[PDB]
Amino acid sequence: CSPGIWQLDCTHLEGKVILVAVHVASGYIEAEVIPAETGQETAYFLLKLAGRWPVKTVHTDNGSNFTSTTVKAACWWAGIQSMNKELKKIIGQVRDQAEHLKTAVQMAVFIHNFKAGERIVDIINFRVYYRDSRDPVWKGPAKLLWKGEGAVVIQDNSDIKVVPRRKAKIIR
Amino acid sequence: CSPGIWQLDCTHLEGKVILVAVHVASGYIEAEVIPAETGQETAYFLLKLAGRWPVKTVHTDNGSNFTSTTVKAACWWAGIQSMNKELKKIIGQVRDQAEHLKTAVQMAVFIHNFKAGERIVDIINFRVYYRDSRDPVWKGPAKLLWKGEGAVVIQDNSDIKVVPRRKAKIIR
Amino acid sequence: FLDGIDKAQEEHEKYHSNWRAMASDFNLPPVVAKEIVASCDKCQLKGEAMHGQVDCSPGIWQLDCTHLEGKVILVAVHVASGYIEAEVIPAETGQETAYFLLKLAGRWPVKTVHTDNGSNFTSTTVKAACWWAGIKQEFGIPYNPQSQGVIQSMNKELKKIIGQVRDQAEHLKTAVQMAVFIHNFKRKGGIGGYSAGERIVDIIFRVYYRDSRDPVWKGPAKLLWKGEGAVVIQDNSDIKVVPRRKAKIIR
Amino acid sequence: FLDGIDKAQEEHEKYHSNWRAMASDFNLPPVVAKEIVASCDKCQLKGEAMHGQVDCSPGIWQLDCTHLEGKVILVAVHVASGYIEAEVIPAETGQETAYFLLKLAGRWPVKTVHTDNGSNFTSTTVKAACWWAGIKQEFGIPYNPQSQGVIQSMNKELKKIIGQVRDQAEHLKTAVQMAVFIHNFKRKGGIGGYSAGERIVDIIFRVYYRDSRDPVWKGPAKLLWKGEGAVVIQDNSDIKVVPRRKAKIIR
DNA sequence: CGCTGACT
DNA sequence: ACTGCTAGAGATTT
DNA sequence: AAATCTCTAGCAGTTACAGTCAGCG
DNA sequence: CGCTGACT
DNA sequence: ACTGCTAGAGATTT
DNA sequence: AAATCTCTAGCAGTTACAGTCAGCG
Ligand SMILES: [Mg+2]
Ligand SMILES: [Mg+2]
Ligand SMILES: [Zn+2]
Ligand SMILES: [Zn+2]
């Protein structure tokens, strides 16, 4: 399965439109209140996802807010049911926790996604970059010997060093 | 003779006061238009000379603009006839070269002093400080081998260098 | 001690000479000279001449607004990856920000937020939001924008990119998110030549001071705490933080 | 050449990617990448990232005004010795300045003056004055205060010293000349620990640019001359100087 | 409801 | 055809 | 202690006004 | 005399 | 009880 | 060419107004 696959959909909760994209190969969901059915806010949404995640393909239907040529232009520049009802039920749960609907929408997206994030992380030994005291230069690839909590044990070419986590970054 | 010796005097050309100090041991003269006879502009004048040259002693008379205690306070904080007539005659010469009198006063002081400056310089081998290109750090004592015009020939510990005069200073 | 000291203190208290002047002139050593200088109150203005280092942890997210074409942009940043979550705010208030942090928690793992003491970010609405989301609300010094420095630089580049692609839109918010696309996925460099999605996915006494835009350095105050970059002090039960560039310590 | 180049130019002309992005993405070398980047107009904003070095000759004297307590101070400086000739101006105009330069020529050997294109220093009165005194009137760039940089720093220290000794006067001009005394004779350091009287007596293509406080970098223009620090250019018979920090050259 | 001060 | 700098304050090495 | 790096504020023509909201009356 | 623009 | 930074542009050494 | 120092603008809540005078009408 491919990573750049997004399935689109929309519902009409409280008589208000909600537009949702779903990472198929992880089931990872982002749903946002669209004020009005049109290609404008749609292309705004795919433009957000475009710069929020690496889109390559959107799967969708013949709705007028999707066949709008603004979609094709913004996308040219740019290059599931059970989930809809999952978020529907969760929205039903936390509707009374927040007055505005859009709030509880993002609360349901939060609940589903974290309470799929580490799934997309799973879709896509270690090297460490660090800073000493009073020397804002970032330092070379440091061989991670151990990752601790609040401190980390690195090795450069001649010095096994302690560094607090507030001055380190660990990248493959 | 001592360097910090200044003789004071004043005249009244065009019915306007002019106050003059004279370096005795060089005859070096600074004369300035004082608007009014008082210790205020007087102490202003000795306060200028105090920060314009290293005064130690002023020789003067019992005039009221001099016995004013403002003089003694500003001075506490701070720590010839033929010249008066010399500048008088020169002022007579260049009076028609400038409308305002104060102007021609400073023109006469200019004429006398440069047309005594190098005398006070005479009252009080070489070391050179320099800057390279794109390195605003000032550099060490460089043994002057020759002083040229527009360039200078220096020696540091291992490099006899050319430097243009726009990037050099020569101090004993 | 030596009458040179007394006349050095009269000299100093009339002219506020430096330590080399009194030292060489009155034939004194540099230490007691620096003790006469350091005994003075007025001469002690300049600070320590050193920046710090912002905390660079995965769970941190900088946050700040800016201004353009009459509109108020809000900008969220990841400290490590340089990633962006930017959007337009129709009119700045705290509720819309709280909705934005809810938007940023529902997409990205947030643990704590480091921004300034602006109006919004102290409201109660934001507090309830980061409370619900398990996010810790951190603040910094008021008049030390460099404490947020990371995000500030982003605005520059963000505005820079808007200089390039403003002719590709009839509206602002579009070009904003376009710039976000460019910076996060299409530009590369820094760490190992990654774009911000690649990085973000790879990771996942007497103390004188001034404040208040007041160049009048403050009188002696009682040092409470010393860290690395800022300090905490007391001037008549006035407990306050100061960054070291804006402060001086007298041991 | 290679269709990768064409799609790199479409890519670039839609997103304005940098050279590493196009290079690594479309599997190209860095040189032609930097040629696509350098072929673009919009991306070419930033300049050369380097300061110069002001001419430090004995016969030079910096000159500039400043503002304090509603009054306008005038400040003359020697570049080498750090010496000062400061005074208050009752109300800034060119004639009073010309009288001041006459005052500074009658006390100190002047050969040439380096200041800015302010109103006064271009008037004819000053020209007649430095004409009579054998003094050469030099100017600098308008919107590059660092070209006078020396004198600017003096104002800081001068104002700093006025912070220390303003309670020793009923008038401003007094405290001004007091500060002059302190800085020139009583403070020491720098060269070898001298005060300014000791030192002063010891001595004695396609080029894009911006100006006019306009962050819109300018279109291609024809380089006329290259020195060390600034350059001279032509945009449709618009002969003008630009400092290198505010300019970029395309070979 | 003012409104203050506090930071932006 | 012209150009950033100065004075302190703190580490650090002799 | 005595020297020798290393680094930053503020100088540059200059500010009183806008925009919010927690907290106190 | 305006006044413009040009820099501070 | 907390902390300046980022992306280019140009020399310069491998 | 390919890497590796080295260094600076502008970001920070934000500007329309004052002060002069050479030059052009
Ligand atoms: Mg802010
Ligand atoms: Mg000026
Ligand atoms: Zn003092
Ligand atoms: Zn481009």
UniProtKB/TrEMBL annotation, chains C, D:
Residues carrying Cysteine sulfenic acid (-SOH): C65
PROSITE patterns the UniProt entry points to: INTEGRASE (PS50994), INTEGRASE_DBD (PS51027), ZF_INTEGRASE (PS50876)
Locations listed in the record: Host cell membrane; Host cytoplasm; Host nucleus; Virion
Any single Gene Ontology cellular-component annotation: host cell
Cofactors required: Mg(2+)
Domain of life according to the entry: Viruses
Reactions mediated catalytically: Endohydrolysis of RNA in RNA/DNA hybrids. Three different cleavage modes: 1. sequence-specific internal cleavage of RNA. Human immunodeficiency virus type 1 and Moloney murine leukemia virus enzymes prefer to cleave the RNA strand one nucleotide away from the RNA-DNA junction. 2. RNA 5'-end directed cleavage 13-19 nucleotides from the RNA end. 3. DNA 3'-end directed cleavage 15-20 nucleotides away from the primer terminus; 3'-end directed exonucleolytic cleavage of viral RNA-DNA hybrid
GO-annotated molecular function: aspartic-type endopeptidase activity; DNA binding; DNA-directed DNA polymerase activity; endonuclease activity; exoribonuclease H activity; lipid binding; RNA stem-loop binding; RNA-directed DNA polymerase activity
One GO BP annotation of this record: DNA integration
UniProt keyword terms in alphabetical order: Aspartyl protease, Capsid protein, DNA integration, DNA recombination, DNA-binding, DNA-directed DNA polymerase, Endonuclease, Eukaryotic host gene expression shutoff by virus, Eukaryotic host translation shutoff by virus, Host cell membrane, Host cytoplasm, Host gene expression shutoff by virus, Host membrane, Host nucleus, Host-virus interaction, Hydrolase, Lipid-binding, Lipoprotein, Magnesium, Membrane, Metal-binding, Multifunctional enzyme, Myristate, Nuclease, Nucleotidyltransferase, Phosphoprotein, Protease, Repeat, RNA-binding, RNA-directed DNA polymerase, Transferase, Viral genome integration, Viral nucleoprotein, Viral penetration into host nucleus, Viral release from host cell, Virion, Virion maturation, Virus entry into host cell, Zinc, Zinc-finger
The Integrase-type domain, residue ranges: 3-44, 205-251
Span of domain Integrase catalytic: 54-204
DNA bind region: 205-251
Main location group: host cell
Record membrane topology: Lipid-anchor
Alphabetical list of PANTHER family matching this protein: ENDOGENOUS RETROVIRUS GROUP K MEMBER POL PROTEIN (PTHR41694), RNA-DIRECTED DNA POLYMERASE-RELATED (PTHR41694:SF3)
Protein name: Gag-Pol polyprotein
This protein's encoding gene: pol
